[PDB]
Subunit: 127 residues, 2 copies
């Protein structure tokens, strides 16, 4: 594949949990979009179960005619970092969920996957 990031999304989209998991370095972290940290840290031993959960989530939205779209990674001037914009869309194109991943790579493996996601709300607080 064109990069380890490309391999990750190709293996994940195909439901190959083990292949997507093997894209991570043993000291990798996946920093999920929601949790107390803020976000939540998954280490390599915890990432496989996360991929399993996400695979079952992907099968559900797929069965509802939704599309998950992962854009081509665009690298930073630090060639070991890249952003991947992504979105979940209904068949008619309505964006259901949208985010961005910031990858840090090291030695052909993912060291950090830092996940950010728009929050779908009616409103927050202003002045």
């Amino acid at each position: 594949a064109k990069s380890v990031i490309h391999q990750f999304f190709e293996s994940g989209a195909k439901g190959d949990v083990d292949g997507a998991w093997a894209c991570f370095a043993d000291d990798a972290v996946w920093l999920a979009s929601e949790g107390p940290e803020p976000g939540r840290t998954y280490t390599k031993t915890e990432i496989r179960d996360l991929l399993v959960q996400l695979d079952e989530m992907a099968r559900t939205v797929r069965a509802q005619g939704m599309d998950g779209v992962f854009e081509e990674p665009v690298f930073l001037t630090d060639p070991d970092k890249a952003v991947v914009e992504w979105s979940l869309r209904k068949a008619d194109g309505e964006v259901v969920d949208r985010g961005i991943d910031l990858f840090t790579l090291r030695d052909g493996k993912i060291l950090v996957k830092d996940v950010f996601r728009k929050a779908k709300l009616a409103a927050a607080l202003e002045h």
Copy 2:
């Protein structure tokens, strides 16, 4: 400034709402991190009031001893795109807010500011 993104953050830090607002193209959008779209689209006529609101929020959390940091902008291999990471820490050092902005530029002006943040749950 080293770039219009630098100018935006430097003007914001200097409380110059009008100077920060003038970094945006007239067809620019600011895509806020929360709302029904998901997120919320603000146009150039709406961005100035956002900056005033953010200015007073920054003064507010600073009075409570929080430290908000914007990292140095890092440009992409597309030189008209860049990311800025940022975070907000309480007095005890606990991170309460962390996010990233993805900027798109056109001819020296900001065309898109696309804001993302972690959801803090405790």
